[PDB]
């Protein structure tokens, strides 16, 4: 189906403990494929997926340069942001950036992204038109005016419509064994007595790729949204994900409850019941 490529970047200042730490990772869909950490012994962009290992030394040289340059501009940006918010130089602050593109099954661009956050809060974002900006406050309006004067959006649009889509296409082909394989969830229901009067029914989805999934409980065919405990989808460590949804069920009611599972690896949604 559709696919995405994203690059994530975090700089965190640490006054009195050296210069800010810079960490960036790249993903295609839910697969990590490159990383770079300024605190590494000899910082370089490193591969994290087999299908990117085949890029030659020119790639790794260029990528490493880009990462180092971004570490440097972020340190200047952190100094800038202290002035914009009238802040002391005493404290730790955080600068985050994400950009990338989504394509449809035909490889064409569905939308691009480029957006920043300071201290955990939205700061400035490129709008879906790839030509105008949403600034969160009057400080980000100062950045907005500078980026409008410099025609930054035009530079980002050219990347997002061109190189971004073209790299994602190359990666999807070179990594077609995995990037284009959906692993369906392995599912079962467990039963956990709480007292004489009620027990937990837990519906499991294990070993699935990609991470997107829907897990729901119904009672007599009605959604139990407010009475379901739904854990956050979590990484297994083997590229796959896990999730469960649990409801508290009065004694003797178990067969009135059904668990419903949707996943792109499933050709039809599943319905499951507790099987004693």
């Amino acid at each position: 189906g559709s696919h995405s490529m994203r690059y994530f970047h975090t700089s965190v200042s640490r006054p009195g403990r050296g210069e800010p730490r810079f960490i960036t990772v790249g993903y295609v869909d839910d697969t990590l494929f490159v990383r770079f950490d300024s605190d590494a012994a000899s910082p370089r962009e490193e591969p994290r997926a087999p299908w990117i290992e085949q890029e030659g030394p020119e790639y790794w040289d260029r990528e490493t340069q880009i990462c180092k340059a971004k570490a440097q501009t972020d340190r200047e940006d952190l100094r800038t942001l202290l002035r914009y918010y009238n802040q002391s130089e005493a404290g730790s602050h955080t600068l985050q950036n994400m950009y990338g593109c989504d394509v449809g099954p035909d490889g064409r661009l569905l939308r691009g992204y480029h957006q920043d956050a300071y201290d955990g809060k939205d700061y400035i974002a490129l709008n879906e038109d790839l030509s105008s900006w949403t600034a969160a406050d009057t400080a980000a309006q100062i950045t907005q005016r500078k980026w409008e004067a410099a025609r930054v959006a035009e530079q980002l649009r050219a990347y997002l419509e061109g190189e971004c889509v073209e790299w994602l296409r190359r990666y999807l082909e070179n990594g077609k064994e995995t990037l284009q394989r959906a692993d369906p969830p392995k599912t079962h229901v467990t039963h956990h007595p709480i007292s004489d009067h009620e027990a937990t029914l837990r519906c499991w989805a294990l070993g699935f790729y990609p991470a997107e999934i829907t897990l729901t409980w119904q009672r007599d065919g009605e959604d139990q949204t407010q009475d379901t405990e739904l854990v956050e989808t979590r990484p297994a460590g083997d590229r796959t994900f896990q999730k469960w949804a649990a409801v508290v069920v009065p004694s003797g009611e178990e067969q009135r409850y059904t668990c419903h599972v949707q996943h792109e690896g499933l050709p039809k949604p599943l319905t499951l019941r507790w099987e004693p």
């Binding site: 790639y59 990528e63 940006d77 920043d116 500078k146 980026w147 971004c164």
Partner: peptide, 9 residues
């Protein structure tokens, strides 16, 4: 492959 445009706030 990454964006190679330097951009300062």
């Amino acid at each position: 492959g990454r964006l190679n445009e330097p951009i300062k706030v």
